[PDB]
Nucleic acid binder design. Structure first.
Lengths: 82, 82
DNA sequence: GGTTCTAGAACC
DNA sequence: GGTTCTAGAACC
């Protein structure tokens, strides 16, 4: 596509059914949910990056207009401005 | 002590032998090592904070002069300026 | 003060 | 461009 590479990766991620259990669109096709950060870093990130680093993932999500939608740091949900 | 509360927690953390396997001083008593971030967040953080959030932990370490000493984001090692 | 989301900055 | 350490900012 014409979108930034990171953005293309994210798209492949949430639209590739094999990642479904770790990262998926929300029911109302509203946002993106990562039920369990640990499982997601283990199983999904390595298919797309040489280094599996959740912090680097979140940093880039922020860079491209995604925000975290508001006890542990296990579940994560993000939504985009545009 | 007179040091900031976060700093007192960190001290209790690395000096309390029961946390030894998750967070400890380095051999040369040089820095602080967290062999496995996941185990550390599971077992150590909850004894000290209502919320176990590694990112909030790292943020505060930076706030108080600690720096990360330079494939996954599993192992972490920090050292202090002063 | 305590916490956590978002951005700066500098290295790759 | 890719990545990751450190700091700003704003809410608690």
């Amino acid at each position: 596509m014409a979108r930034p590479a990171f953005v293309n990766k994210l798209w492949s991620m949430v639209n590739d059914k094999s990642n479904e259990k770790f990262i998926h669109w929300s029911t109302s096709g509203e946002s993106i949910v990562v039920p369990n950060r640990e499982r997601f870093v283990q199983e999904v990130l390595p298919k797309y990056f040489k280094h599996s680093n959740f912090a680097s993932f979140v940093r880039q999500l922020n860079m491209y207009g995604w925000h975290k939608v508001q006890n542990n740091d296990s579940r994560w949900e993000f939504e985009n401005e545009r």
